Amino acid sequence: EPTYDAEFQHFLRGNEIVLSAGSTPRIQGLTVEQAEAVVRLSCLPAFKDLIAKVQADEQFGIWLDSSSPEQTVPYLWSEETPATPIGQAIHRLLLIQAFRPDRLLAMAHMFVSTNLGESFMSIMEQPLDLTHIVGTEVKPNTPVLMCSVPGYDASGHVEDLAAEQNTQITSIAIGSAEGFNQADKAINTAVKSGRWVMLKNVHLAPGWLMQLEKKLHSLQPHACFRLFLTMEINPKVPVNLLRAGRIFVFEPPPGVKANMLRTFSSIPVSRICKSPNERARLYFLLAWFHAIIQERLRYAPLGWSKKYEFGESDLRSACDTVDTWLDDTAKGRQNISPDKIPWSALKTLMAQSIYGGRVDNEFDQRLLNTFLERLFTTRSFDSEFKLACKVDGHKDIQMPDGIRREEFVQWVELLPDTQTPSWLGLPNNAERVLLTTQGVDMISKMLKMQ
Amino acid sequence: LKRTVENIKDPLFRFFEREVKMGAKLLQDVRQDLADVVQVCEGKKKQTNYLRTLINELVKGILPRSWSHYTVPAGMTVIQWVSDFSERIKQLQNISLAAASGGAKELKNIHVCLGGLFVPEAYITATRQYVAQANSWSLEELCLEVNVTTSQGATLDACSFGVTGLKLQGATCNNNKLSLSNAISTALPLTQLRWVKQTNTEKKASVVTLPVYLNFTRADLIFTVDFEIATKEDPRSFYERGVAVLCTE
C-alpha cells in the first residue's frame, strides 16, 4: 500500500490550505461551508474534477441528507489505476470530512475496520472483564488505578470481583489522617498475607499517594496480593503513580434511561415508599428532571451555556427538600390531593437553591425555570401528561399511570433504547452538531500526535 | 487612526482607535514571531527556548499563549486564528481608511461585523452614546431594537447602525419574525440596530429575549435582543431549543 502521505496531510491540515476571498463559487445544493470544503479538497489531484462531478450528480442530495452517508459514499475521486480497499477507505474519509463532518467519526470507524479488523474496536464495546485482567495481566506490585469521571463511583466493580473470585478484601476510605494509618497497617498485613486491599477516594491525598508509590516501588508482595485505588479523574494525582499503575477509566453509560435507573437504585426503597403515596411520583419527576439537565450537559454549548456540576449532591438536596415539604403538608395523611402539593415551594427551591445555585448565566436560569415549570405542576398527576412533547417531531412520551415505585421503575426499564436530543427538548440536529465537534476534536488531537 | 480635536468627541472614533491600537500591536507581535519561525526553518536562526516552544505549538496546531490577547474559542487551531486575524485586520484597515477619507461621520454609516471587533460590547455602548449625543436623550432612556433586512442598500435611519456577520442558531428570521428551524445555523443579513426612547410599552406575549453570544462557545454574552415570534409557537420552546445569536461562527 502507498503511504498516502498527501491524502492524510490534507485530512489533518486541509483547512490550512488558503481560499482567496471570493474564490469560493456557489454550488447547487451545497452550503457555504461545504463549498469551502470542496474547494479545499479540489487541491488534491484525485479530487480535481470534484466540483463538476458533484454538480452533475443527480442523486447527490439524497446522499447528503442521508442518515448514514458513510456506508454509501459516491465514487467521485479520479483514479489513474484502480485503488486498494484502504485507498477507497481514505478517499471516502476525505469526502465525508468535506461534506458530512458530523459522520466523520463513524467514517473513521470504518477506516479502522478496513485496516485493523471488524472486531478490533468491538472488545471495548463490552462489559469490563476485570477478573482475567487482574488475575493474569496485573502483577502484585502494580496497583490497579480505577479512575472515574467525577460523581461516579467504581468500587462496586471491585467488590463484585472480590465476591466472584472468593477473595477476602479490606476496603478503607482515605478521608482523614487516621485513614493513612489504617491503610498502612492493612497494606503491611496484606502484602505478607496476600490479601486484597482497596483504597477509596485516594485523589483527596496527592502527597500520600506519592509516598505510597515510593513504598510500592520497594515491596516484595505475595503473589495473590492486589491493591486497588479508586479515584476521580483529577490532575492532582501524581504522574509517576499513573505511569507505574494499571489505569482503568470508568464513565457512566450515556442516556436518560441509565441515569434514571442509577438515581432509583441510589435512593433507598424505604424513602420512596414512605407515605403519602404521591411521594414516589414526585421522585420520578425529580429523577426525570435530574436526567434531563444532566444529559443536556453533553450537548453544551447548545444544551447549556457552560458545563455545570449537576451532581448527586444536588439530587440528595432535592430529595431532602421534597421529603421535608411533603412531611409538612401531609402531616401523616396516607394521601394528599395533587393540588395540595406545594408546587411553588419545590419550583422556587430547585430553581434557586438546589440546582440554580450553580447557575450563573441568566439565560441558563431561565431555561431551568422553564424546565421546572413544565414538569413540577399539578398537571403532572394527570394520566395524559407528556414528559417530552413531539419526540422525533411525531411521537410523545407519556407519564406512567402507576403510583408505586415498582411501576415507575418498570416504566423506566421498558423505555425505548433509541434516544434522540428531542427527549431533552433540544432539536435532533443537535446530535449532528455534537458529533462534528467531536469530529474536529479527533483531527486536532491527531495533529498533536502527528 | 489620526486623532484630532473634532473626532475625539465621537465615541465611535474612540472605540475604533482603541481597536486599531490593540490590533496593530498584536499584528507586530505575530509578524515578528512568524519571521523568526521562518528564519529558524531556514537555519538562519537558532532555536531559543521561547522559539522552540513556539515551533512545538505551531507544528501541533496548538495556538500559542503568546498570541491570545483577545477572547477566542478555547481549543482553536492556528489556521482559524490567523484567518480570523486576516478578517479582523482587513476590517480595521477598511474602517481606518473610511475615517481618514470622510472623518468620523462615516463611522456611523459603515456596516461593522461585531465578530471582527475585539470588544463589540464597546461598539454597542458607543452606538448608544452616539444616539444619546445626537438626539440629546439620557442613556438610561434608550432601548435597543433589531430589524433584519434582506434588501440590498437598505437606508439606515439616524438612530440605526448596520451590522453584518451575525448568525442565528436554532431559528430562521422572516419579515423580522422568528420561526423554529432544524438548520444548525442561518446567516443573518445586514442587521439594523436601532436605539429608541424606551416607551412604556407592555411586553408582548409574542416577544422572546434571545442572547447575542460572542462566539459558538457562548462563554461571553454581549447583549440581548427582543424578537417577535412568527407563529403561535410558545416562547418557552425557544428557551428549551437553546435558540441564540452569535457575532461570529
H or E, element range at B87: helix B78-102
Beta-ladder partners of B160: B194
Determine whether the interchain pair A433/B184 forms a contact, defined as Cβ–Cβ distance below 8 Å: yes
State how far residue A372 is from chain B, nearest Cα, in angstroms: 12
- Whether the Cβ atoms of residue A147 and residue A248 lie closer than 8 Å to each other: yes
Helix (H, G, I), strand (E, B) or coil at B174: strand
- Whether B242 has its CB under 8 Å from any CB of chain A: the answer is yes
Name which of A417, A387, A354 is nearest A281 in CA terms.
Answer: A387
Q: Helix or strand or coil: residue A113?
A: helix
What SS3 class is residue B25? helix
Strand runs (DSSP E) across A134-250, as ranges? 144-148, 169-173, 196-200, 226-232, 246-250
Reading the block at residue B91, the C-alpha cell is 476590517
DSSP state at residue A176: S
* Half-sphere exposure at residue B180, Cβ-oriented, CA atoms within 13 angstroms: 19
Taking CB atoms and an 8 Å cut-off, how many pairs form between chains A and B?
Answer: 62
How far apart CA A204 and CA A342 sit, in angstroms, is 40
Q: How far, in Å, CA of B104 to CA of A170, rounded?
A: 77
Contact B239 A16 (CB under 8 A): no
- Helix (H) or strand (E) segment spanning residue B246: strand B244-246
The 3-state DSSP class for residue B74 equals coil
DSSP structure class, residue A137: I
Q: Which of A305, A426, A432 sits opposite B241 (nearest CB)?
A: A426
Contact call for B61 and A447, based on CB within 8 A: yes
Residues in chain A: 450
| Residues B241, A425: C-beta atoms closer than 8 Å | yes
Question: Please, are residues A427 and A421 in contact by the beta-carbon 8 Å criterion?
Answer: yes
Q: Which amino acid is at A355?
A: Y
Query: How many beta carbons lie within 10 A of that of residue A427, not counting itself?
Result: 24
Question: Are B219 and A306 in contact (CB < 8 Å)?
Answer: yes
A15 vs B: CB within 8 A: yes
Contact at CB, B182 and A427, closer than 8 angstroms: yes
Q: Position B186: which residue type?
A: T
Q: Which residues of B touch A363 (CB under 8 A)?
A: 211, 221, 239, 244
Question: Are the C-beta atoms of residues A108 and A12 closer than 8 Å to each other?
Answer: no
Tell which residue, B185, B176, B166, has the closest CA to residue B206: B176
- According to DSSP, the β-strands at A386-391 and B177-180 are unpaired
Residue owning grid cell 494509618: A181
Distance from CA of B111 to the nearest CA of A (A): 18
Distance from the Cα of residue A361 to its chain's centroid: 24
Technique behind the model? cryo-EM
For residue A370, the chain B residues in CB contact (below 8 A) are 236, 239-240
CB B173 within 8 A of CB B245: no
Interchain pair B239, A305: CB under 8 A: no
Four-residue CA torsion sign, B183, B187, B188, B189: negative
What is the C-alpha to C-alpha distance for residues A23 and B144, in angstroms, rounded to an integer? 37
Contact, A172 vs A155, CB < 8 A? Answer: no
Question: Cell numbers 489504617 label which residue?
Answer: A182
Indicate the residue type of B5: V
Nearest residue, CB atoms, B242 vs list A16, A426, A444: A426
The CA distance from B29 to the nearest CA of chain A, in Å, is 21
Distances (CA, A) of A356 to A284, A301, A309, A352, A392: 20, 18, 11, 4, 29
Burial environment of residue A4 by CB neighbours within 10 A (0 to 12, 13 to 18, 19 or more): middle
Query: Which cell is A31 given?
Result: 452550503
> Is the bond preceding A143 in cis, omega lying within 30 degrees of 0?
no
Q: Are strands B142-148 and B191-197 parallel, antiparallel or unpaired?
A: antiparallel
Q: If we measure between CA atoms, which residue out of A333, A134, A331, A144 comes closest to residue A231? A: A144
